[PDB]
Amino acid sequence: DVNPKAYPLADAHLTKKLLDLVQQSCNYKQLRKGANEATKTLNRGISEFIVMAADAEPLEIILHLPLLCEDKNVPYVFVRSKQALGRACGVSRPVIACSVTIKEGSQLKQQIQSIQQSIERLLV
Amino acid sequence: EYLVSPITGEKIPASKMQEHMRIGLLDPRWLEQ
């Protein structure tokens, strides 16, 4: 619709679960905010999935994240609002890229797999 | 878009959300000060 670049854009039903899981991971010290930290997590091989917004001003400053996710075999999905993603990150400022990171013994593991399966279903 | 208020219990436009949270909890003692 608004952004054809938003290939990984999720629908209303899925974005609620995305934001809720992002907030839960933030509560578990499991979330990284910003495109730079998402890139760092992808390089380090610690992120299991990456979310980003579809309303970045250039939209090319988070467009390398899909390529790096394909390189590192990490699912990625887009949302339609940066402000809501930032709020789900616990940050007043808008966030256009967030990463959820692997932890040992985390209790969010099952929700992580569920959201990854849904993200993979969105692609293609 | 429209969003529910976590501070007022009302529906607000998505574009005013940031300002709505910024000034919906402006401490009245700031106005007194």
């Binding site: 609620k16 907030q23 709020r87 616990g90 007043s92 | 529910v4 959300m17 949270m21 401490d27």
Partner: peptide, 21 residues
């Protein structure tokens, strides 16, 4: 959808409600 007020914002809301009471 719903929105999540941040931790500082929660602290401000709780403090304001307590001061009001």
């Amino acid at each position: 959808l719903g929105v999540y007020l941040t931790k500082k914002e929660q602290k401000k809301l709780r403090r304001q409600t307590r001061r009001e009471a």
